[PDB]
Design an enzyme around this catalytic site. Structure first.
Site, PDB file in Angstrom:
ATOM      1  CB  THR A   1      -2.689  -6.217  -0.058  1.00 23.40           C
ATOM      2  OG1 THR A   1      -3.291  -6.180  -1.369  1.00 23.40           O
ATOM      3  CG2 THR A   1      -3.723  -5.792   0.975  1.00 23.40           C
TER       4      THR A   1
ATOM      5  CB  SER B   1       1.416  -9.019  -7.313  1.00 28.12           C
ATOM      6  OG  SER B   1       0.140  -9.548  -7.091  1.00 28.12           O
TER       7      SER B   1
ATOM      8  CB  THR C   1      -3.203 -11.474  -2.788  1.00 31.50           C
ATOM      9  OG1 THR C   1      -3.917 -10.345  -3.294  1.00 31.50           O
ATOM     10  CG2 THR C   1      -2.895 -11.354  -1.311  1.00 31.50           C
ATOM     11  CG  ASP C   2      -4.223  -9.319  -7.789  1.00 29.38           C
ATOM     12  OD1 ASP C   2      -4.404  -9.018  -6.568  1.00 29.38           O
ATOM     13  OD2 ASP C   2      -4.988  -8.981  -8.711  1.00 29.38           O
TER      14      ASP C   2
END
Lengths: 330, 330, 330, 330
Positions: B13, B60, B93-94
């Site tokens: 992101t 990710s 972020t994941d």
């Protein structure tokens, strides 16, 4: 004149026993019967006319769909009785949140329904179950509880059965909601600060009286290097919907997307939840093209909550647009 | 005079783009190369001498173990260079929390390593990535970061890479630890309030320079009416350990215990984690007889974290008692 | 072979009594003497050799500086004794956080010091004090506690006495820190996840053995339409420092700034804290020109904490730059 | 067609400016006029027909009661206009929570009223005010906001103006409620999860149109070794009610009780709040004999909130029983 409350026991830590007073965490669930639970809180007689029934005697991690139906059908029968004003269910913590949401969706009554457990067995010093059970009966006996949907009353709180979750291990504050407690219960009295927004109980389109067996629904986890194996295997073994417990905003690995497209084409509903559970929600069409793929997002609901709603919803519809409406209303 | 910091870009992101300034949540990850990230924060030149490299350009949720190895090995090469003072990794972020913990376990350097992402793409109004990247470089440049293990610097915080997790969806406060932030970073300055107490980096027994492959580890979820299907399928498709994401205190349904016993005798490690992630930990011998069954508990570590530790540990040992020691030290 | 632990009783809810088992919230503090309090947990013998002393018998909201000095001096006498391995202080919740921080600043010992209270009196159903006291003795007896500074052991946690505060009313989870728990204590065992990063106990420049009196320090609150009245009145009645419990980042109303400048010139130290207590800190020279005015910011410390640090610090210095260093190190 | 929204500017960080893009925390409030604020979010024209008014230009820590009346009366005039569908107020953070609650009590309109600020000035990297202002206008334009009371729309949330408070310094997540967010606002859309359960706006017994000047109310803090000085001085200088920001459950030092009894006898209302603000509430008759003393408890309301409600309530009544009713209904 005191309210008539029925306590439906199912097992759990609240009915558990360990070897010593310091064994607050290592114990056996589901050892004490309902009459012993009631006799352990003699003060219940001050606040309600209580009677108990033993519905089952289980460790809640081992609950089945048939156990949910048996409990839900007994709750409905009691709710239909002019002799019953409120209902308390004693339950293990592990799947308390699943039972509480299920009942919130399928019990078409305004009578209070409270689910309650404990984090320490009654053999431990400073055990939490006695006051939790007192508080459950107080809340189930309170006019303020009517029409509020299913409630959970641990840690001096009034939590919505919809979105409370087991969030903290070991500690008595285990059950939390992203959207806060709705109230508190202190010295027998209920104090409310928020009301539900989401459909429940009497305003639900679902009714336990019509459900004979629940559809099979399973859950698969997302993480680095995940493959499509669990999704395919769960579907091959009967899953009518898969809850995807994704990273982030319900994201799906590029190695998993093709399998989920094939499963949807073959009739399996695909519901995107997440393992990001303290707040926020999974947004439709953000991480994946849900419209193109005919998938559903689980909104704020955690994977095990989403499984409950998916099962109930699929007793009525196979239309993924209707399932999405249901995930946006309940 | 200024610290030499290398930014290793991986996607995410923070490198993403949406259609309009109002698209804070619906966007494409991994659109901007490292040079564009650096150009977007001209203020970096005030606080460090920065150079960028593109290691990968991914969303990710789609990361692989080969990606982790390539990233880990490049971090180690840079940390060996006298021309590198600190390293920043830009990441989706994941699975940020997975990468951060992996690096914490396998990089035997005291040089600062910071992993950073954003919850809004740089195209959005009020995008968080610019200040997050500035802060990452500040922290990577700071003498106070040396010897602290891998750090994550979102939301004005200094979080431990060990136990920070993506806990809140959508909001910029997404990354939280049960054990609190260790510090904050504000106007380029770092303020510390806690130190790590688990083994990391230079005091780790693991070393990326000695790891050329990672054992396959998979994750299965626990919920009402769960069956043994996912566990068996994952093992049949190569899993050397299974992370059990149980209800409650890592609890296992009576429908699943027999399969897990059979799997352990067949040489699959069984690691009990949970989906109760805000606090607490999974206690050995409480919910299941781990000594009798030769199982392991994941302590406080969430399922995806437990997978990372198990996979790193199993490059060195398959002794269940050693694995439990590792789960109690890292 | 067991640690020798001394329990110093001061009063509080833990030693309280209410009228019935349902009185978890309405009760009288400081009714039970130390011997009967200890006899309520006979299991203590399993974990330590305990003895008790009654230092005082108070409701903690009524504590004085003389009470702090007496308690602090008795703690120091016991820590000097080779017959004492660890010390537990039973205390009312209201000012527990103030006592805990005081001791953290003035006791130059590595021996464990634990302060503990309860949210429910011992007469109540599900009273928390028995397990809290067991856990305080466990932590005070544990080698892991040596050198960690003062600890607070409620809610199955190990909290730093520095920055834990009474944050939630009624519930047993009352004591929280912005920087997280450092550990947990479960079935007698301590599990650590963070270490302190602020000066304490053996590394403190302050020593109770050198303190015979404490300077008077008072606290005034900031809010809309606040005036300088409380500030001036508190200084007129002896305050040597004023803790400003400001809105936001320690902000000061334009109606109050002139009085604080005149107070500072008259020799009153002006310390900017806030009523924004869940996280963050008060940044020097942001809301007010602290260098120009010769004021001090309280960093992350809440008003009552800042009062304790100021009062201790002013036994040694009244240099505002040294006070600021102290507020940045402790 | 688009909703007609009026933005009433009052100053604050959202209208602030710092020296460089890295100055997220050190800046000057109240520098930008409303038209420049609006022009910084050109996307507003997509979601509403916006016009701005400059009501005042202040740092909110310096707000007065006369400022609240001026703002509240202009809000009322606009709400009476057929050309106005919703109202946004841009405000400094420090006393945002006081203004929001005030307006919730005295504006007898169902039209949406949103108060909004920022934690970073618009000159900073990753400034939060643009999206906060967009979200405030979105929420003010949304039919779902009608009838919900005053709302605060920072950090992607819909918070109740009643009980949201500035709880975290520095970070963009500053505004929190003990009872949770009610909703979220993402990409222009509002998502509700809870409804208010306290009296507000159209169902309030109070009306700004009748209030010409507010009664004087002040706040005094409780802590170890506190004296009655601030209470007496504040009353001597005009306080018609004193908010007691007690330790714990609104507890009062034995050295303070006699003064508060005398003040009540002399006509000053005594309202027991606390500095224990993350959860719970202050229970009548628990810590002090409120019935005997004719005192009031502030329920869950923090000191500055309790001051707002006391001032509004005392425009109607001097009867402590009616003031207690109001503190239990609003």
């Amino acid at each position: 004149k005191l309210a008539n409350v029925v306590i439906l026991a199912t097992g759990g830590t609240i009915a558990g026993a360990g070897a010593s007073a310091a064994n607050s965490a290592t114990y056996q669930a589901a050892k004490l019967g309902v009459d012993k639970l009631i006799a352990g809180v003699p003060e219940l007689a001050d606040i309600a006319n209580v009677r108990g029934e033993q519905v089952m005697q289980i460790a809640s991690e081992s609950i089945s769909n048939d156990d949910l139906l048996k409990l839900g059908k007994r709750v409905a029968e009691l709710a239909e009785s002019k002799d019953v004003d409120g209902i308390v269910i004693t339950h293990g913590t592990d799947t308390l949140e699943e039972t509480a949401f299920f009942l919130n969706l399928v019990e078409k009554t305004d009578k209070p329904i409270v689910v309650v457990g404990s984090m320490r067995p009654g053999t431990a010093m400073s055990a939490d179950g006695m006051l939790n059970l007192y508080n459950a009966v107080a809340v189930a006996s309170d006019k303020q509880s009517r029409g509020k949907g299913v409630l959970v009353t641990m840690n001096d709180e009034i939590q919505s059965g919809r979105d409370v979750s087991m969030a903290v291990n070991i500690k008595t504050e285990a059950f939390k909601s992203a959207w806060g407690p709705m109230g508190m219960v202190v010295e027998g009295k209920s104090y409310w600060f928020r009301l539900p927004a989401k459909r429940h109980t009497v305003n639900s389109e679902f009714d336990i009286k019509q459900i004979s067996s629940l559809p099979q629904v399973d859950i698969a986890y997302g993480y680095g290097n995940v493959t499509d194996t669990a999704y395919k295997a769960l579907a091959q073994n009967g899953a009518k919907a898969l809850i995807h417990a994704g990273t982030g905003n319900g994201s799906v690995s590029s190695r998993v997307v093709p399998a989920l497209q094939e499963l949807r084409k073959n009739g399996v509903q695909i519901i995107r939840s997440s393992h990001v559970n303290q707040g926020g929600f999974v947004l439709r069409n953000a991480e994946q093209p849900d419209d193109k793929n005919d998938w559903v997002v689980a909104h704020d609901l955690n994977p095990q909550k989403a499984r409950i709603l998916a099962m109930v919803a699929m007793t009525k519809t196979q239309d993924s647009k209707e399932l999405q409406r249901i995930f946006w209303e309940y």
